[PDB]
Design a protein around this nucleic acid. Structure first.
Ligand SMILES: Nc1ncnc2c1ncn2[C@@H]1O[C@H](CSCC[C@H](N)C(=O)O)[C@@H](O)[C@H]1O
Length: 327
DNA sequence: GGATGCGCTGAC
DNA sequence: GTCAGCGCATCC
């Protein structure tokens, strides 16, 4: 994550729904905002969240009386994506894990914050012939909010990962916000190789599979794209090896394969998956952020998370718009 | 819970 | 056909 000198969100209160690691919290607090409520029902996510923020998020949002939620200016929510992801069954709103957006709407209807800041996977924008995105748009409009949505790729914002996500920013209409803009892309100057830990700290992640098939030669020049070098087994998810001179593939939460949830990388002549701390870095988390003691849970958590830097640029722009109040 | 072989869609 | 994918199935 980056340092933000001009704290555009100072004096603003926000809530951290589907909190996870608290990615939205890091991003908004870096702009000066204050978190006044957090919600996350996973046992291990609550533990790591508490480890880093000193609070245990409240459980199951579907059982929370929206009236008990503290007043706030901005509502943050990177809601569940298993039901919308290209990697899933795409049952969408029909999936028991796909109706969480309506809980968000329920809370918005009651608390009417100035801004609603949501995130989900790229496929969310095309799911069900665009009807899924349309439903969210119309729901927000019905609640009297504007609706700004765009898919942003983390590689365009200084983080070496091909993570494409749809970001939805909604402003309460009475605010008459007409100048919100998504951050402009800029040249990537950091690559996977730049975030790796020393070999001595990741030896246990090195695997030598006899069914390794290197399909492409290593590149010497860094490039802002994923560069597959080979595969193991049948080349499915978690069975693909990439160049550290390129960018990381999208980290996943329930991913399988031998290089599960992070993908495999060619590092100093050896093939290995990423260490949880490298996952943190690939997600824009500062080294000061404490990862969960269970490596399996840590991989899951970062795989479900958001790239801090991207949220920071968006948050700064939300604040920039909220603060432009000329006579 | 932890680990890993795979399905199979969206977007080229 | 090629590649990527906050995933799924199944085993202990
Ligand atoms: N009913 C529910 N109540 C509370 N949290 C829920 C929930 N259903 C799913 N979640 C939580 O929703 C999260 C979605 S992933 C979002 C992660 C978050 N942006 C962070 O930065 O890491 C998961 O952590 C999941 O456990």
């Amino acid at each position: 994550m980056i340092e933000i000198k001009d704290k555009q969100l100072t004096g603003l209160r926000f809530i951290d729904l589907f909190a996870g690691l608290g990615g939205f919290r890091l991003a908004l607090e870096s702009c000066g905002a204050e978190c006044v409520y957090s919600n996350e029902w996973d046992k291990y996510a609550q533990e790591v969240y508490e480890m880093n923020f000193g609070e245990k998020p409240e459980g199951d949002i579907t059982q929370v009386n929206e009236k008990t939620i503290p007043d706030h200016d901005i509502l943050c929510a990177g809601f569940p994506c298993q039901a919308f992801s290209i990697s899933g069954k795409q049952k969408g709103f029909e999936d028991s894990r796909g109706t969480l957006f309506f809980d968000i709407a329920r809370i918005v209807r009651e608390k009417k914050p100035k801004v609603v800041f949501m995130e989900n996977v790229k496929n969310f924008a095309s799911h069900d012939n665009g009807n899924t995105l349309e439903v969210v748009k119309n729901t927000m409009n019905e609640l009297d909010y504007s609706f700004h949505a765009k898919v942003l790729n983390a590689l365009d914002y200084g983080i070496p990962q091909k993570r494409e996500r749809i970001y939805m920013i909604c402003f309460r209409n009475d605010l008459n916000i007409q100048n919100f803009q998504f951050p402009k892309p800029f040249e990537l100057n950091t690559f996977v190789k730049d975030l790796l830990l020393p070999d001595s700290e990741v030896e246990h992640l090195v695997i030598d599979r006899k069914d390794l098939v290197m399909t492409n030669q290593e590149i010497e020049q860094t490039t802002p794209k994923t560069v597959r070098l080979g595969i193991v087994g049948k080349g499915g998810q978690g069975e693909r090896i990439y160049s550290t001179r390129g960018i990381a593939i999208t980290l996943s939460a329930y991913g399988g394969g031998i290089f599960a949830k992070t993908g495999g990388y060619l590092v100093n002549g050896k093939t290995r998956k990423l260490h949880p701390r490298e996952c943190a870095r690939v997600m824009g988390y500062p080294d000061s952020y404490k990862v969960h003691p269970s490596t399996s849970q840590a991989y899951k958590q970062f795989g479900n998370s958001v790239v801090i830097n991207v949220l920071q640029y968006i948050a700064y722009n939300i604040g920039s718009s909220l603060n432009f109040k000329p006579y």
